[PDB]
Design a protein around this nucleic acid. Sequence first.
DNA 1: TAGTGCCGGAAATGT
DNA 2: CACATTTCCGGCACT
Length: 104
Amino acid sequence: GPIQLWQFLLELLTDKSCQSFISWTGDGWEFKLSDPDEVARRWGKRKNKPKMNYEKLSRGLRYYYDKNIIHKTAGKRYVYRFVCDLQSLLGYTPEELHAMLDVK
DNA sequence: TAGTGCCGGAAATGT
DNA sequence: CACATTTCCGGCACT
């Protein structure tokens, strides 16, 4: 079972106990790694990569640009946005998930 | 400045 | 394998 990066992020983004380092911005599917190092750290443990960091992690994200899985919110640091049909994948709309997560 | 975000090419890596 | 990162790096831009 090899989880992919974009799926790891979704996993973090739907667990309240993770809002400290990663969270939805309240605008659709846009999200922010408030503490990229902690995200990278956890991404590193899951994949067994002791030397993982936000630099390498984000190169992973950049490869999603053409795959249109995740796009970059230009100008906002550590801010990206899922551009794929997450409403169909998760079954929730951004509002519903935000409400359910207590996103502010 | 040099430090840091961010970008995308090139090659390595590993399940 | 196929390929999704992982790793490394020259570059551009901003503070």
